[PDB]
Amino acid sequence: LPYKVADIGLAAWGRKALDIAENEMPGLMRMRERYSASKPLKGARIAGCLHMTVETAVLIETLVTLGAEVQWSSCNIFSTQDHAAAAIAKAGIPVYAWKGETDEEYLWCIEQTLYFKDGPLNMILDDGGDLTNLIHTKYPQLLPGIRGISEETTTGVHNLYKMMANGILKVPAINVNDSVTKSKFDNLYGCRESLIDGIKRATDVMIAGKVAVVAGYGDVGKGCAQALRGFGARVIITEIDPINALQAAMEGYEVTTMDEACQEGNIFVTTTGCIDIILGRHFEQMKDDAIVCNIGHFDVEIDVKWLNENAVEKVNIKPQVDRYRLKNGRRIILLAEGRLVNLGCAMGHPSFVMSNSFTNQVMAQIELWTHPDKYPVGVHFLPKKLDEAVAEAHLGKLNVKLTKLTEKQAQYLGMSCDGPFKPDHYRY
Amino acid sequence: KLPYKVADIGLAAWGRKALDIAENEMPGLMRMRERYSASKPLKGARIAGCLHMTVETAVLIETLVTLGAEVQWSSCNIFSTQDHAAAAIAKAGIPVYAWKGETDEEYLWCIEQTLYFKDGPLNMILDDGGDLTNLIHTKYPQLLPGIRGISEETTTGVHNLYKMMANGILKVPAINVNDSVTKSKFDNLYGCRESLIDGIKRATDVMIAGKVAVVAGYGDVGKGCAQALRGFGARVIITEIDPINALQAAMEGYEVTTMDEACQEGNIFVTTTGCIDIILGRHFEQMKDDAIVCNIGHFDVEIDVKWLNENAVEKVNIKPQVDRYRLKNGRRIILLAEGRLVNLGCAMGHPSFVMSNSFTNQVMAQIELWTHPDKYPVGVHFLPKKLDEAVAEAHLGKLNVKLTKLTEKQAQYLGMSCDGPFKPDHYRY
Amino acid sequence: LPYKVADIGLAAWGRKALDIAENEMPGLMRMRERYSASKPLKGARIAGCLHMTVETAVLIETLVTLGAEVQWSSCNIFSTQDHAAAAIAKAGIPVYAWKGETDEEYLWCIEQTLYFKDGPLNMILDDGGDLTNLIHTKYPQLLPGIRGISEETTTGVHNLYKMMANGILKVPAINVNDSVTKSKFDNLYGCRESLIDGIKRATDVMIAGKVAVVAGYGDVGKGCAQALRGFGARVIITEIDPINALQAAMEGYEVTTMDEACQEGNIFVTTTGCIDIILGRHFEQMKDDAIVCNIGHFDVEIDVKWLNENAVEKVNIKPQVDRYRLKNGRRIILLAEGRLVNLGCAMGHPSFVMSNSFTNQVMAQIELWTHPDKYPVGVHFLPKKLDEAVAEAHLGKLNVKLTKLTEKQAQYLGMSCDGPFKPDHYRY
Amino acid sequence: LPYKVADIGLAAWGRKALDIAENEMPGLMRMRERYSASKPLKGARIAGCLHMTVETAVLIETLVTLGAEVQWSSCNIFSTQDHAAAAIAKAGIPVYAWKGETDEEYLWCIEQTLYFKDGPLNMILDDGGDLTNLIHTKYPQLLPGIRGISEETTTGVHNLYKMMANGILKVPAINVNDSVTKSKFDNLYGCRESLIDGIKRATDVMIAGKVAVVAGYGDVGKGCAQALRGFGARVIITEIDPINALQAAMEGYEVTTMDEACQEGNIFVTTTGCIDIILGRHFEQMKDDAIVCNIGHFDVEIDVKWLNENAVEKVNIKPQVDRYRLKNGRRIILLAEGRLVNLGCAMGHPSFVMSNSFTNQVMAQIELWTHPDKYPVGVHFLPKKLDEAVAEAHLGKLNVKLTKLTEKQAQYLGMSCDGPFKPDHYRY
Numbered sequence A, C, D: 001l002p003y004k005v006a007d008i009g010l011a012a013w014g015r016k017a018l019d020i021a022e023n024e025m026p027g028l029m030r031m032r033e034r035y036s037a038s039k040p041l042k043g044a045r046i047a048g049c050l051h052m053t054v055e056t057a058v059l060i061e062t063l064v065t066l067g068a069e070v071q072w073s074s075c076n077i078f079s080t081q082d083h084a085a086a087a088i089a090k091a092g093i094p095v096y097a098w099k100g101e102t103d104e105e106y107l108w109c110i111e112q113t114l115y116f117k118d119g120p121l122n123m124i125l126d127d128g129g130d131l132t133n134l135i136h137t138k139y140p141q142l143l144p145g146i147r148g149i150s151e152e153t154t155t156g157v158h159n160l161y162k163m164m165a166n167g168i169l170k171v172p173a174i175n176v177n178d179s180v181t182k183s184k185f186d187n188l189y190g191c192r193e194s195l196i197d198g199i200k201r202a203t204d205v206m207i208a209g210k211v212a213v214v215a216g217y218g219d220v221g222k223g224c225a226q227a228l229r230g231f232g233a234r235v236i237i238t239e240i241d242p243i244n245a246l247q248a249a250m251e252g253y254e255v256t257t258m259d260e261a262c263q264e265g266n267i268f269v270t271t272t273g274c275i276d277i278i279l280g281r282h283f284e285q286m287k288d289d290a291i292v293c294n295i296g297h298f299d300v301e302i303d304v305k306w307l308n309e310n311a312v313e314k315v316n317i318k319p320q321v322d323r324y325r326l327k328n329g330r331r332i333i334l335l336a337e338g339r340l341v342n343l344g345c346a347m348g349h350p351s352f353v354m355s356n357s358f359t360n361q362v363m364a365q366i367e368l369w370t371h372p373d374k375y376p377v378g379v380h381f382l383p384k385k386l387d388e389a390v391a392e393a394h395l396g397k398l399n400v401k402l403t404k405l406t407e408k409q410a411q412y413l414g415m416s417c418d419g420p421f422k423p424d425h426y427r428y
Numbered sequence B: 001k002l003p004y005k006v007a008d009i010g011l012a013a014w015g016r017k018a019l020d021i022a023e024n025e026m027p028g029l030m031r032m033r034e035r036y037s038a039s040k041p042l043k044g045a046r047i048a049g050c051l052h053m054t055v056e057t058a059v060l061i062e063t064l065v066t067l068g069a070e071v072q073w074s075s076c077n078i079f080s081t082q083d084h085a086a087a088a089i090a091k092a093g094i095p096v097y098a099w100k101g102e103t104d105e106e107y108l109w110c111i112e113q114t115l116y117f118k119d120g121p122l123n124m125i126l127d128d129g130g131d132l133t134n135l136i137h138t139k140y141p142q143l144l145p146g147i148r149g150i151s152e153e154t155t156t157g158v159h160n161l162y163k164m165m166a167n168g169i170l171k172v173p174a175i176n177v178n179d180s181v182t183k184s185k186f187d188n189l190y191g192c193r194e195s196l197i198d199g200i201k202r203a204t205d206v207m208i209a210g211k212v213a214v215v216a217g218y219g220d221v222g223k224g225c226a227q228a229l230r231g232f233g234a235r236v237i238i239t240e241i242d243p244i245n246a247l248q249a250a251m252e253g254y255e256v257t258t259m260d261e262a263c264q265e266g267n268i269f270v271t272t273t274g275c276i277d278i279i280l281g282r283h284f285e286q287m288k289d290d291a292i293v294c295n296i297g298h299f300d301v302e303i304d305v306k307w308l309n310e311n312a313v314e315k316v317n318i319k320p321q322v323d324r325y326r327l328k329n330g331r332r333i334i335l336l337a338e339g340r341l342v343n344l345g346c347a348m349g350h351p352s353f354v355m356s357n358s359f360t361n362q363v364m365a366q367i368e369l370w371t372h373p374d375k376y377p378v379g380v381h382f383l384p385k386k387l388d389e390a391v392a393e394a395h396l397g398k399l400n401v402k403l404t405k406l407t408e409k410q411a412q413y414l415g416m417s418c419d420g421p422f423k424p425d426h427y428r429y
């Protein structure tokens, strides 16, 4: 089996989508402009485990343009876009991914990416840690032949630190999740674009003139709060961290508890990454047809089980939109069954966000592959200069003219005119 | 003869579900039910309505019925009906003649069925766009003495009403509700603010932040569009022919220049002028690759779509109402809704709460015309300010707004009534 | 007497401040550019009565440039800037004004302006209606030889409408006050600009993170609320008009009563134009060191008398800043003794704001004088095409490039390509 | 000599200002609430070198309230508010500082703080490193008796790493400058409040409708841009960092070069911390009466020397406001001679900002004095849990209600419910 896709005939529709996405992903296209001649990944045999979307197809074809051998599988059973996968298969690349895999087929799809034309993998590009854990626990014989790992997920990086503390990790790993360019686009800018899009497709509701309660004021909360405020909603924040709580107050947001705010809100958005945020006792105080949704962590934040078990009516309105009637006579509108509203009720992040994340991945691959004896086994942050480079790559598309330091200004500032321009502890 | 005519009356239960959701978002119409269902002030009325047969309009329809009126209904556009909403109205025993995908002949037919009731011909006209008003004057001028009032809510329709008075054709009193504060601001500003981006997003899924968005026009639509784009992190450039409107944009920090200049800078183009020849061939040729171009102003006149069709070397349809043209220079143009209204072509229009402000405006006008025959001679009138205010007050509860009441002493000082109106007719808000 | 000033040897300083203020008043300078050669006012003896400031000094010299004889007095006792007064006296213009006049001297100064070198006044330019009221009641002989009045005050136009209601107005007038370009700048943009300057100079207080309660959401309220919000304050609104209240809600502001909001606010700002807004029972509920000020109508909005009568301490911190201690042991910081904070604690509106108000005046003078057989004896709004021309005059300074309607476009729209562009009911 | 102040008779005025400041400095009043009974600084002989302002005077009396003996001097010759220094003098606290000191007097004043009644100092509270530099060079005898150093300045902290690298630092030190609660208030929020205050007092110019060029988009630039945008100015950013350039772009600011931007701007503000930002080449292109000022680094950013050397006129308008006429006949308005505009033309940061920086200082002292063993000789960041504590201390004043994690939630998140809540790399 050279690949496995749902329908190869969808390749043409995929290529048209790719062509449109390329123009919103200038960071990846910049890497093609810079590195297509020199091919810094010639020799590399990269196994990738990452959502097989249109955006990811741009990543895959960028890596190939840089000289690498690439074989791919999706890191989720439902997230694949079949036409994107088809387009990649038609271009010769071994890709094992389709929408609605079984749990057995998911494991099998990863298995087909380990050995290549010219022997086993020597690089891992990862999103969730599933490819990394499969090698270590099942195929540890292959570990010495692997030069490096890239990982861009919070779960995956926590897992990498765990493997290092337990002495299990045997390959140097670059964490790109904590890049400024990755984190700000994935957490803040991304959710700022897509939140209200999810709410609108689901409900078509008037945002302006409503009280909106956002639980959490981290990067995701900041983003959501800014989007809602922009439409003319009155935004109330809840926070546990007094620093984040202070930030909110300094922008003019009311900051209070969910115990208080549940009587106020017309819309509730959870962004905490934490369990037990919206509970039965909160639901019972809510205004009629209050909209409740999550954009934070999987499905743990809203007590959905409570609604199923305590409501008198549950009525499906349209896909991923349920309207529960309670014992008190009032209604709750739940979106995406408590799951991520931006993926359940909308299309997730825009292409431009994904460009920042995936450009970080490309940087990490080059850095590990081109500099073998520069990273010992262990989890490493992406160097700042490469993080800056990711940002630089996107400035052209953003109509931005960057100023260059003069030799004299550099000397005064005690930094190189090429970077990095900030110390490692700098918060931006 | 036919008691109603609609695509599929089996969709009525789905209709009722949508009505129930939207009723909560339409407190204006629902407060009308609260205070006038007892007294039934439209009793003995027989209202022929011509208005898009939607969920919102269904709530309008039933509010008219709740207040004692007899109602018969047709849509004012051939594609704008929601069949489930029309089914729900048909299941409730109301003569509705409407479906999505009508012929120009079926459209005319649908309106003709609403003129005669069992107890006699129409008493009142509720209109959007003038077509019901135009049919009775052209073709059924016998009925004109029987008709007590007209409500009209469209710019097109109000202009037409003023043209008919100038020539002495209009034989019925009419209330222009289009120029109400509560109507104009919701329909022009707040509505477009909410739905522009919904249109753009559903069509393209594009990142709005970090883009130059060129907004032609800074009227109320323009102001809303500009504000919406700005809030996403787009750099909004504006074009204007009116120095006051141009000055307003400058005072909010927007760059104001010409389309001749701005066509080189913009990633997104949005027309809001209500005027022809806004975006043109010479502009298209200057644009960046994959410049998203759309319209939220007047029907399809603002963008020269005919130019694109005649001059592009490729035209590929990406999805419904989204076309990607390739030009002779090898660069591409993404056009939304074929130059038609992007918020209605690529999304579902305005939210229920916007529509509530407009439709409560209609209900106010009807009661006023029916209850007070001697008060309005033949001609075009604005809705009185005190009724405009009542529309706004009817939505304050929903908005968690506690309104202050003037003390007797304060009202004497200010020289107004404590119940209003609170502003003179020239006041601009 | 040719003039009367405090010190005519302050004219160097005056001319310097004029030269600065001319650049920020392009509306008046555009009038000099268009009209200095044609002198449309040639034969106009204009008797003015308006605050004798650097700003107004520019207006005075623009009228002269446009070919008019002009004689001036101040419409207020304290508002005259003496260096500006000096400079106008030096250029051979009869100006009778200084800072700290008596009520008797005030009436005398205005009486001197009525009689020119060549006879009685041809025109009236007025702010507050005092010059208009003087000639009707005290000098009824001069009415037939005066072609028109320009008025730019809420006070003044109401008095003009009262005079016309009762039949004691024998000369036609232009109401400039309800021009878009006057109203927006004087009410909205000006107060947005100068409220916070007023508060800061008085207190130096942090705005961000405070609850700021703004009574009234008219043009002043909107200005004040937008400014406070921009600094990161949580703005609460009070209103009696449901339309205005709806507007505030649609921008995300909380809207509640003063009876409720007095327990919340760190800063109170009154803009209603109405009596009995902030009262003793509101003062008793306020947080410690609540700042209370007025930017609306004179001194009727806040019950300052109550504080004087009921406080246990009254300390002056600095000029126009009083700190009261109440029986409950809590403190109130009152700005400007309940007078206008922007004029009491700061310099009032910027020059650019004033340029829009006075260019409206200049237009009114040209319109009445150049068209005698057009305006019959009454109160009129400045024509829209002239309101438009005020705005146009400032666009150059704003770096604005105005589009011109092609003839084909103007036909479609059924208007002229020179205007007016909007109907008379249009609200902007 | 017990103290040396300009005039002790200004202490009733000072106490009055002190009483106002206290209510805006909840951080320091919360430290007085918690620790006034326990007396954690009991025994501590603190020598502080820091601007002798009303704000600092609260910090001083907070340290005394915590059971410390404190001797004080200013860290700048002009920054003392004499009336504040008199209040601290009358409270019986040895303070040696006045407005307008000589460089020999400045030194003298710091030398008077080293020696108390009971003996020599145990602790150093510092701003700019001049107390710390004096003792190591000129009083190394006192080094072993000194338990800890607090320091809150970029200059002062860069200096500790220069000392530590060369083995001369022989006292443990806490860097408080890079705390979240210090950095955000001193840099971003502070300048957001005070920039425009500076420009207004100097010029009274309309901000709305103008192009404003902000050089730099760091914390200072971010604040300055946000403030200008809030008034209705069109803001243009210049940047050398692609990440910060990207951040500006994502909020809809234009990002171009000064070489291009100099032809556009009505207002210019420099925030880079870098030399050669505004130059003669730029000045020659500027619009007539461009307002140019600096809020970044001292007087290096704007080539003020060029203006003095190449302009045909230089005219003082008022203190710290100079208006040059250039060879091309156009005018430039320089503010504060290119020095910090917020301190040159206004009062600097509000009391509430300063509360965050000086509460950091209190936290630093307790942590050093009560835990000597914990800190080896070196430069240490302030621990996060204390940074959090600073923020928590201000929430009460802000009307903020912080949520507390349940035991179950804390367990799920792998953190204590008392904190810290974020890892050390977290950027807020």
Ligand SMILES: NC(=O)c1ccc[n+]([C@@H]2O[C@H](COP(=O)([O-])OP(=O)(O)OC[C@H]3O[C@@H](n4cnc5c(N)ncnc54)[C@H](O)[C@@H]3O)[C@@H](O)[C@H]2O)c1
Binding pocket: A154, A186, A187, A190, A191, A215, A216, A217, A218, A219, A220, A221, A238, A239, A240, A241, A244, A271, A272, A273, A274, A275, A276, A277, A295, A296, A297, A298, A340, A341, A342, D403, D405, D409, D421
């Ligand atoms: N939906 C998406 O597409 C998407 C995108 C990026 C990240 N995320 C996820 O969203 C979550 C948040 O990400 P982030 O970057 O904002 O994290 P963050 O650490 O920046 O912010 C989370 C905030 O929630 C607060 N918090 C924790 N428990 C709380 C409680 N019980 N009540 C109130 N506040 C509480 C914390 O103080 C913290 O400030 C994560 O789980 C992340 O994986 C989702």
Ligand SMILES: NC(=O)c1ccc[n+]([C@@H]2O[C@H](COP(=O)([O-])OP(=O)(O)OC[C@H]3O[C@@H](n4cnc5c(N)ncnc54)[C@H](O)[C@@H]3O)[C@@H](O)[C@H]2O)c1
Binding pocket: B155, B187, B188, B192, B216, B217, B218, B219, B220, B221, B222, B239, B240, B241, B242, B245, B272, B273, B274, B275, B278, B296, B297, B298, B299, B341, B342, B343, B344, C403, C405, C409, C421
């Ligand atoms: N999409 C929708 O659902 C929807 C909703 C409401 C209104 N509208 C329509 O939108 C249009 C605009 O409505 P409005 O209330 O903002 O009108 P408006 O009069 O308030 O504003 C239109 C503006 O366009 C400007 N303009 C005209 N020609 C121009 C040109 N060639 N270049 C630049 N500017 C120009 C005018 O100066 C004016 O300020 C109307 O056709 C209206 O019917 C659409």
Ligand SMILES: NC(=O)c1ccc[n+]([C@@H]2O[C@H](COP(=O)([O-])OP(=O)(O)OC[C@H]3O[C@@H](n4cnc5c(N)ncnc54)[C@H](O)[C@@H]3O)[C@@H](O)[C@H]2O)c1
Binding pocket: B404, B406, B410, B422, C154, C186, C187, C191, C215, C216, C217, C218, C219, C220, C221, C238, C239, C240, C241, C244, C271, C272, C273, C274, C276, C277, C295, C296, C297, C298, C340, C342
């Ligand atoms: N400070 C200045 O230099 C300056 C500048 C311009 C205007 N003004 C003055 O400020 C005042 C307001 O001007 P405006 O143009 O906003 O008038 P406006 O009529 O547009 O607005 C006043 C608002 O106050 C509301 N109001 C009245 N009584 C109220 C009450 N008891 N509680 C709450 N709201 C109440 C009204 O509903 C109205 O919307 C006027 O007196 C005007 O003369 C002052």
Ligand SMILES: NC(=O)c1ccc[n+]([C@@H]2O[C@H](COP(=O)([O-])OP(=O)(O)OC[C@H]3O[C@@H](n4cnc5c(N)ncnc54)[C@H](O)[C@@H]3O)[C@@H](O)[C@H]2O)c1
Binding pocket: A403, A405, A409, A421, D154, D186, D187, D190, D191, D215, D216, D217, D218, D219, D220, D221, D238, D239, D240, D241, D244, D271, D272, D273, D274, D276, D277, D295, D296, D297, D298, D340, D341, D342
């Ligand atoms: N006036 C005040 O009260 C006050 C308060 C705090 C800090 N500061 C000072 O302000 C300055 C900046 O502080 P910060 O916290 O913003 O530092 P920062 O590092 O966060 O910001 C400085 C920014 O300027 C940019 N920059 C450097 N050289 C440049 C050039 N030639 N052109 C354009 N941009 C350039 C950098 O990319 C950087 O992002 C420092 O000198 C600091 O001491 C002043």
Ligand SMILES: O=C(Nc1ccc2nc(N3CCOCC3)sc2c1)c1ccc(CN2C(=O)C=NC2=O)cc1
Binding pocket: A051, A053, A054, A055, A056, A076, A078, A079, A343, A344, A347, A348, A349, A350, A354
């Ligand atoms: O995880 C992702 N998508 C996902 C997974 C499961 C799922 N299950 C659903 N339902 C279906 C109806 O029945 C109930 C369960 S919807 C759904 C969506 C996912 C994450 C990041 C990117 C990254 N990304 C973008 O955001 C845009 N391009 C990208 O690559 C994609 C998908």
Ligand SMILES: O=C(Nc1ccc2nc(N3CCOCC3)sc2c1)c1ccc(CN2C(=O)C=NC2=O)cc1
Binding pocket: B052, B054, B055, B056, B057, B077, B079, B080, B344, B345, B348, B349, B350, B351, B352, B355
């Ligand atoms: O007009 C509406 N809708 C519409 C949709 C498609 C369409 N397609 C057309 N054709 C043209 C000829 O070529 C082919 C395509 S015309 C047309 C019209 C419409 C307006 C107001 C409200 C009012 N409204 C809201 O906005 C929300 N609820 C409402 O009732 C509805 C629909």
Ligand SMILES: O=C(Nc1ccc2nc(N3CCOCC3)sc2c1)c1ccc(CN2C(=O)C=NC2=O)cc1
Binding pocket: C051, C053, C054, C055, C056, C076, C078, C079, C343, C344, C347, C348, C349, C350, C351, C354
């Ligand atoms: O009315 C104006 N100024 C004014 C009047 C009286 C007054 N009384 C005071 N106190 C002092 C202490 O004892 C008690 C009385 S302070 C004060 C200030 C006034 C209005 C518009 C413009 C128009 N204007 C601007 O706003 C800017 N340039 C202008 O021309 C000016 C002043």
Ligand SMILES: O=C(Nc1ccc2nc(N3CCOCC3)sc2c1)c1ccc(CN2C(=O)C=NC2=O)cc1
Binding pocket: D051, D053, D054, D055, D056, D076, D078, D079, D343, D344, D347, D348, D349, D350, D354
């Ligand atoms: O350095 C400070 N202020 C200062 C220094 C010198 C100076 N020189 C001037 N001119 C005068 C006319 O001739 C030319 C020289 S004005 C001026 C002002 C300084 C810093 C932080 C805080 C800390 N701070 C605040 O920011 C607010 N409260 C505070 O404690 C204070 C002052």
